[PDB]
C-alpha cells in the first residue's frame, strides 16, 4: 500500500469530461478491460468520487485530437481535430474502482506501450501517471493483428526514458493469463495522495 509513482502527463491530455466506460470508438485492436482500484496511501482506504481520465494512442501510435502525423511538442498544445477516441473518464465507486473497456495501446517512436491516466480529487489534480505492461504480455500482443502490421521497433520498458525516470516498475498492470486466450483483463491497484497538487501536467 505504498505510494504509487507519478509519471509525466506528456503533451496530449485534453481536459474534457467524456464519461464513459467503452472508449474504443472506430479504433482497431485487441480488447482490453482495465480495472483501477484507488486507495488513500495514508489509510489504505478506498477513495470514492474521484474522476479518473485515461488516454492512449491507437495501434499505429496516434492520439485523437492530434491525428496530424508530425506532432511537435510546444508550450501551447491544442487539439487540431475533434476526434476523441481512446479517451474517457470514470468516477470511482464505493470500493475506489473504475473499469474501462479499451484496446491494448500502440507504441510510437521513442516510447514503450502505455496508457496515460490523471486523477482529480477534491477539485485538485491529485495524481498523474502511466500504466505499463509486462514484457511477456507485450510480446504476445505484438504477434497479433493488427499490431503485427506495425513494423517499427518496439521500445522496451527498460529503454523508455519515462519508465526509467519515474519508476515505472510500480505501475505495471497485472493481466490475467486466463484472458490471453473475448477480452484481456487487467487490474492495477493504485495508492495516491488525494491532498497532493500534482505539478506533472504539461500546460
Ligand atoms: C472539477 As475537477 C474535480 O474535474 O478538477
Ligand atoms: Fe503518450
What are φ and ψ of residue 19, in 5° steps?
Answer: -95, 100
Atom of ligand 1 nearest to the CA of 120: 3
Which approach determined this entry?
X-ray
Residue 194 DSSP class: T
> Is 63 annotated as a binding-site member?
yes
The dihedral over CA atoms of 188, 191, 193, 194, expressed in degrees to the nearest 10, equals: 60
How crowded is residue 8: how many other Cβ atoms within 10 Å of its Cβ? 16
Contacting residues for 43 by C-beta, under 8 A, at least 6 apart: none
C-alpha 45/C-alpha 13 separation (Å) is: 28
The Cα–Cα gap between 32 and 74 comes to 31
Among protein residues, the one whose CA lies closest to atom 1 of ligand 1? 123
CA of 69 to the centre of ligand 1 (A): 31
Q: Within 13 Å and on the Cβ side, how many CA atoms surround 176?
A: 13
DSSP secondary structure string for all residues of 122-160 = TTEEEEEEEEB--HHHHHHHHTSTTGGG--SPPPPGGG-
Q: What is the extent of the structural domain holding 176?
A: 1-203
- 8 A C-beta contact, residue 31 and residue 184: yes
In terms of phi and psi (left: phi > 0; alpha: psi -120 to 50; beta: otherwise), the region of 146 is: alpha
Q: Is the CB of 51 under 6 A from ligand 1?
A: yes
31 pairs with which residues across the strands? 103
Ligand 1: which of 49, 51, 198 to mutate, most ligand atoms within 8 Å of CB?
Answer: 51
Within its chain, how far is the Cα of 90 from the centroid?
A: 13
Residue 161 C-alpha cell reads as 526514458
The full DSSP string for 40-57 is: ETTT--B--S-EEEEE--
What does the block give as the cell for 89? 473518464
Q: From CA 66, how far away is CA 84, in angstroms rounded? A: 9
How far is the centre of ligand 1, averaged over its atoms, from the C-alpha of 79 (Å)?
20
How many domains does the structure of the chain reveal?
1
Of all ligands present, the nearest one to the C-alpha of 58 is 2
Query: From the CA of 196, how far away is ligand 1's center (Å)?
Result: 14
Resolution in A, one decimal?
Answer: 2.5
Q: Which helix (H) or strand (E) holds 186?
A: strand 184-192
| Three-state secondary structure call for residue 94 | coil
CA-to-CA separations, 53 to 119, 161, 202, in angstroms, rounded: 6, 23, 15
Amino acid at each position: 500500500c505504498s505510494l504509487s509513482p507519478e509519471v509525466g502527463e506528456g503533451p496530449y491530455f485534453i481536459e474534457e469530461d467524456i464519461i464513459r466506460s467503452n472508449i474504443v470508438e472506430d479504433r482497431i485492436g485487441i480488447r482490453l478491460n482495465v480495472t483501477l482500484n484507488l486507495v488513500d496511501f495514508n489509510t489504505c482506504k478506498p477513495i470514492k468520487g474521484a474522476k479518473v481520465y485515461i488516454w492512449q494512442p491507437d495501434y499505429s501510435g496516434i492520439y485523437s485530437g492530434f491525428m496530424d502525423k508530425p506532432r511537435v511538442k510546444r508550450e501551447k498544445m491544442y487539439p487540431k481535430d475533434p476526434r476523441r477516441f481512446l479517451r474517457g473518464t470514470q468516477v470511482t465507486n464505493e470500493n475506489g474502482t473504475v473499469t474501462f473497456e479499451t484496446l491494448f495501446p500502440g507504441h510510437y517512436p521513442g516510447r514503450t506501450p502505455h496508457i496515460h491516466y490523471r486523477i482529480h480529487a477534491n477539485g485538485n489534480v491529485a495524481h498523474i501517471g502511466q500504466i505499463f505492461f509486462d514484457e511477456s504480455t507485450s510480446q504476445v500482443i505484438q504477434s497479433k493483428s493488427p499490431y503485427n502490421q506495425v513494423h517499427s521497433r518496439r521500445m522496451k520498458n527498460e529503454e523508455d526514458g519515462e519508465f526509467t525516470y519515474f519508476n515505472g516498475k510500480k505501475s505495471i498492470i497485472n493481466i490475467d493469463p486466463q484472458s490471453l486466450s473475448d477480452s484481456l483483463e487487467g487490474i492495477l491497484n493504485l495508492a495516491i495522495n488525494p491532498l497532493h497538487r500534482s505539478n506533472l501536467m504539461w500546460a
